[PDB]
Amino acid sequence: RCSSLQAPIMLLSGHEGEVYCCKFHPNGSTLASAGFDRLILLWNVYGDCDNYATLKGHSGAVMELHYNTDGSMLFSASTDKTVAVWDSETGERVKRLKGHTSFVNSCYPARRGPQLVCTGSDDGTVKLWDIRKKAAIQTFQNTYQVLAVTFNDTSDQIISGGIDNDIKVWDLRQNKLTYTMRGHADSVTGLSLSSEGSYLLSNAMDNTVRVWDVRPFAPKERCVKIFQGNVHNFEKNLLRCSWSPDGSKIAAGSADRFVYVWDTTSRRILYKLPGHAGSINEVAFHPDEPIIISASSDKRLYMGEIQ
Amino acid sequence: DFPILCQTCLGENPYIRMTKEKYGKECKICARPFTVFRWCPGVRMRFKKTEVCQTCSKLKNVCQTCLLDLEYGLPIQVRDAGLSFKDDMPKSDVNKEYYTQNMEREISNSDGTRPVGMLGKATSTSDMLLKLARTTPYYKRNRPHICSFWVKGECKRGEECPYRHEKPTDPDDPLADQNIKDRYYGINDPVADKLLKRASTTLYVGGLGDTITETDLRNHFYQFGEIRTITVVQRQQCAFIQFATRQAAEVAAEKSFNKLIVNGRRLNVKWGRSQAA
Amino acid sequence: KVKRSRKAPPDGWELIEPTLDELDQKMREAETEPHEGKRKVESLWPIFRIHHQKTRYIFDLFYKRKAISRELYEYCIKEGYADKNLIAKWKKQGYENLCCLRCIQTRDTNFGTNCICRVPKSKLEVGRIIECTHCGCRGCSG
Amino acid sequence: SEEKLQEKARKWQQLQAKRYAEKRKFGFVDAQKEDMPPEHVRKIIRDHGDMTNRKFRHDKRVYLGALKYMPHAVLKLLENMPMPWEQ
């Protein structure tokens, strides 16, 4: 009906708790995943003889996980209320950053890589972090808890979203943010930005994917498209929306226990992938090969491939 | 691998905490060890349980706790006798019944719990059981558990302990709870009581409309007997079915009174005047 | 602390001896009386209630009135006069007023933990609150 | 929606705080075994245990398990040896 056939897939076991997030390295060789077990998951993935290994040292469950553009380092946000800097290929991590009053909501690297990484904490903290200086960048507070915070492609802007029920645009290098762009509604299922930088795709807790095209330069404050048809979160959940720039695609999780694939520019979605025993927490898309990482509450990562 | 657990004994709460039991008491019918699941539908209501095994629940095709008739939510006995005739051998020698049940379930490769629903074509007893069933009869189906200590005033705990005061009823007629629990399939029961209580030349029929035509009423009423004529009035959305013999007029008369559903639309049919008016 | 060990405790125990003697007399009187009132699991309530009363008396003497020396408090704790675990949970934020240690046992319950005696009356239903079967004890009026 | 922002901010603080209320990595520990009163369990159990009648009627099978386990009393009694060297 919707999905096309079945095709082979890879099931990744070993996660004690529900997987919080899933991501892949820029080279596509390894894929790391975070979960409630407070142990990062390194994976030899892109084809399977094996995954990679298990990473430890997190004092609490990792809320978010991401990899640096270089691939040798990665950042993670955990309930330990400390920014997690991890070196991986060296056998041990990077450094542990402190100063968060509450648990770290999300941590993502910027366009400068290890130089600065945008992060936020459920206390409502929106803060850039310098790393290689053995100290962060700067701290800021806007309204309320920011669910997701990520820097733009030019590293000069930082987009964030959370319980504040608004689209958060932040200017950074000016020691102040950018603008607050929101319609009339309150929902946050997550926040995301496209790779082109001309639009941002945020997840709405009403089960409504909101793609907004505004972009820098000429004033717009416009939108992109309204994606629907799949329920991302039933009541309250954190879903990481990762779009697939290959062709045109948008990947997201769902509370229906099915991976959510959405085509956008066609004014309709893509496909729904069943086979998950629980609600999908996060999904990823490999740039090199058409593979998608499936992280769900079932603690089993399902990586699909299109042939 | 849950039990039957129909919608009547589930309760109004969406979320329910149930505790399975691997080895429980033997089934009252199959007389074999099985799993015993316990849950409390109500806040202050007592926890439920299932005394029917997988073979006991599959043989009668009933809920593991309430043990109603099929999935229709009616009393077992009456609806079972209304299905065809009986089609059972509960009587005696469970050792001989263990071979028919073991070979039954072992030889049946098509079954399931709930990856399915409906998928039938009408029914003979769906109208009688549908008219004999209510909407979620969950009132006083779990908690009360009448206690004689509070009736005699000897209970020290009182309402703090379970079995709340003023629970019992007049020991005269069936107790509607433990009375059906005394036997299983044997008694006629309020199944049969409420079954008999549920059972109780021209014919006018209203509520036709544009969906119903004259050929449908002529073909439906023609099965009872020869029809003299039919008067189709579209302005009043009614039709008069005149039969030559009043026999079929009485059959289709009584059977056509608020029993008539044509193309999924109920029709109110009243007896013709025949008073020369 | 009625055992045969060689102690010679400080005079504080000699001053608090009548209280422990009365508690032991009430414990023996409660343990020597069966129940014909058709109650099985409810017969163990006054034992845990009296134990919590003695533990609350020792903890109230050492940690509030300050009328007992640290050596006497350690001799009473190591002598079996009071529960060290119940007093440990009483000193921290785990329990300010504790009924019994069995109510906090996670594995003792079929499904879940935290016997309803530990739930506040705010969220809990006052009609179905009644009393705990295991613990019971603390609280009277409603 | 300022009132909905403050109320939704408190409900969100109790929400994310409720998710962080676990404070256990892959689960937590269990209840540690504590010593019960000796006279309560000893005197009450052994007092009502040997009475049988309708009090121990449900305890019957439990006693069948007691007698059904030999090594408990053998290894317990043989394992308890105050010895003449002390008192």
Partner: peptide, 22 residues
């Protein structure tokens, strides 16, 4: 399977007789 923490809030809402389908 779902989360156990979410089932605790669902049971707490069930004891409060919360029928909200939102």
């Amino acid at each position: 399977p779902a989360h156990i923490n979410d089932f605790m809030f669902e049971q707490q809402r069930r004891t409060f007789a919360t029928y909200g389908y939102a």
